[PDB]
Paper text:
The galectin-4N-glycerol complex was determined at 2.00 Å resolution. The binding sites of all 4 of the monomers displayed clear density for the bound glycerol molecule. In addition to the glycerol molecule, a water molecule is found in interaction distance of Arg67 and Glu87 residues and mimics the conserved interaction observed between lactose C3 hydroxyl and these two protein residues. In our human galectin-4N-glycerol complex structure, the binding site of galectin-4N is pre-organised to interact with saccharides. Importantly, in the human galectin-4N-glycerol structure, the interaction between Asp69 and Arg45 still forms in the absence of a natural saccharide ligand. Due to the weak electron density and the lack of proper coordination, we have assigned water molecules at these positions for the galectin-4N-glycerol, galectin-4N-3′SuL and galectin-4N-2′FL complex structures, despite the high concentration of Na+ ions in the crystallisation condition.
The overall fold of human galectin-4N is the conserved galectin β-sandwich fold comprising two β-sheets, F1–F5 and S1–S6, of which the concave side of the β-sandwich (S1–S6) contains the saccharide-binding site. As with other galectin CRDs, the amino acids forming the binding sub-sites C and D are conserved, while those that construct the A, B and E sub-sites are slightly different, granting galectin-4N its unique binding specificity. To investigate the interaction between human galectin-4N and its natural saccharide ligands, we have determined the crystal structures of human galectin-4N in complex with glycerol (the cryoprotectant), lactose, lactose-3′-sulfate (3′SuL), and 2′-fucosyllactose (2′FL) at 1.70–2.00 Å resolution.
Residue numbers in the entry: 15 to 152
Write the structure that this text describes.
Amino acid sequence: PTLPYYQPIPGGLNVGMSVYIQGVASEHMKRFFVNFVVGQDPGSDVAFHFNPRFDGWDKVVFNTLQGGKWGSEERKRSMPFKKGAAFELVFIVLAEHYKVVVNGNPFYEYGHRLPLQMVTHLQVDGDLQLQSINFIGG
């Protein structure tokens, strides 16, 4: 797949589903993001925004965009990615939260703010190369 990636999730998002992303973080990475998006119209809500950042104290930001407004940011001050390194990024969709697993290590649990069944698309962009995106357990 090529970037930017913005594709429908087959059968929409459901509990039990996993999203498995294999990529390589850019040698020159500042940020990238993975968005679980409600539709493909301009100004679509983002149920879940997953945003690793190397600017400043290395961290990952988690948020929701609803009605044009970013919510209260959640943050984990730990960077499971590495500039120039291949990664395995898994989102396990559970009833209570998205469980994020990076290179086999449980990383974060992001509680649902928008109903997960409203999600139609996965969007991925930023400072990385994409090797594959797979939807499992749909």
